[PDB]
Amino acid sequence: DLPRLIVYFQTTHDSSNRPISMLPLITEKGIALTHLIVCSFHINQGGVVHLNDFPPDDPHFYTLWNETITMKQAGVKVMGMVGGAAPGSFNTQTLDSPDSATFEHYYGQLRDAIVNFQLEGMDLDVEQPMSQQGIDRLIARLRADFGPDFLITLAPVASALEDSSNLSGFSYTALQQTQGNDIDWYNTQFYSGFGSMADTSDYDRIVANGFAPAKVVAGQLTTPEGAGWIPTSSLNNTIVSLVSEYGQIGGVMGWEYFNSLPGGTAEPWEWAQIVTVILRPGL
Ligand SMILES: *[C@@H]1O[C@H](CO)[C@@H](O)[C@H](O)[C@H]1NC(C)=O
Ligand SMILES: *[C@@H]1O[C@H](CO)[C@@H](O)[C@H](O)[C@H]1NC(C)=O
Ligand SMILES: [Zn+2]
Numbered sequence: 001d002l003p004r005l006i007v008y009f010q011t012t013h014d015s016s017n018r019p020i021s022m023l024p025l026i027t028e029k030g031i032a033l034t035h036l037i038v039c040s041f042h043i044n045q046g047g048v049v050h051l052n053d054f055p056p057d058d059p060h061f062y063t064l065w066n067e068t069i070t071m072k073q074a075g076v077k078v079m080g081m082v083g084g085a086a087p088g089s090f091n092t093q094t095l096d097s098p099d100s101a102t103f104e105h106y107y108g109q110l111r112d113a114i115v116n117f118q119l120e121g122m123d124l125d126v127e128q129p130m131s132q133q134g135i136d137r138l139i140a141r142l143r144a145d146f147g148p149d150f151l152i153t154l155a156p157v158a159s160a161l162e163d164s165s166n167l168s169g170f171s172y173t174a175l176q177q178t179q180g181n182d183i184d185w186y187n188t189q190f191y192s193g194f195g196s197m198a199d200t201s202d203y204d205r206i207v208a209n210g211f212a213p214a215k216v217v218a219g220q221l222t223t224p225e226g227a228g229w230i231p232t233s234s235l236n237n238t239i240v241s242l243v244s245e246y247g248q249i250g251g252v253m254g255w256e257y258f259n260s261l262p263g264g265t266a267e268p269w270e271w272a273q274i275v276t277v278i279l280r281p282g283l
């Protein structure tokens with residue numbers, strides 16, 4: 001059900017090392033959260049999968065995993081993301097390995113984490129180069145093992161869907177051609193210099209390059225701690241225009257939860273309330 005409202009949840013504990021609850025996203029009024037992406041999972045050569053600084057089964061994450069059950073009860077799909085800023089998950093030592101046993105070993109760890117933590121999807125946020133063969137295999141294998149209703153997404157930077165600047169090495173247009181039916185949507189990063197939601201031009205260019213609006217989620221920084229943040233009012237103006245063109249867009253994702261403007265660390269759920277008013281103004 002479009003539009004999706006997706007929140008990345010990377011910072012899991014506050015400055016006092018206390019868990020940050022994800023539950024206000026379902027308990028505070030006026031939020032239509034569709035997906036919560038727990039991140040960032042890391043594949044480590046010679047190691048075990050980590051969620052940020054600890055293995056996901058560590059006591060550090062007891063509160064997190066307990067809360068995910070409640071999120072799912074409320075109708076939110078809980079996914080993981082592997083990759084992001086920290087290199088190591090998609091190189092020739094791990095998931096891009098040309099050694100079959102090495103690939104099976106690290107892939108098996110990812111598969112096992114998905115099963116053990118009862119995730120409903122996986123976002124492959126590839127921010128270092130990975131071969132075409134490697135990404136194609138990973139997606140096809142995930143699809144093979146987890147079935148057609150498991151969610152598989154990627155997080156291209158916006159220009160990577162416009163035949164331009166790309167963090168991932170492989171081609172997203174080639175990927176869409178060969179594995180597009182296995183990919184539910186693209187968490188498209190309109191920030192860091194790679195694209196802008198301040199007008200419709202970038203989103204329209206991506207659509208014209210063969211990526212359906214239903215599969216292009218407009219990614220947004222939730223704070224100006226980075227490059228390319230825009231006010232939600234600007235986001236709204238652009239989305240109104242896009243909807244007039246396409247009827248339905250893929251939705252919006254936010255990087256990342258805990259300190260989101262306007263409410264900050266005190267009230268980080270206010271972002272999701274505002275974006276819900278943008279995407280579903282009749283709710
Ligand atoms: C919930 O937390 C308890 C610790 O109080 C832990 O034993 C249990 O495994 C947790 N549940 C999940 C799904 O992680
Ligand atoms: C979005 O923009 C339209 C057109 O300017 C406006 O009517 C509406 O108030 C805006 N919605 C939100 C949630 O800001
Ligand atoms: Zn460790």
Ligand SMILES: [Zn+2]
Pocket residue numbers: 084085127
């Ligand atoms: Zn990132």
Ligand SMILES: [Zn+2]
Pocket residue numbers: 084085127189
């Ligand atoms: Zn990113």
Ligand SMILES: [Zn+2]
Pocket residue numbers: 148149
């Ligand atoms: Zn189905």
Ligand SMILES: [Zn+2]
Pocket residue numbers: 140143178179181182
């Ligand atoms: Zn396929």
Ligand SMILES: [Zn+2]
Pocket residue numbers: 162163209
């Ligand atoms: Zn093109």
Ligand SMILES: [Zn+2]
Pocket residue numbers: 263267270
């Ligand atoms: Zn407030």
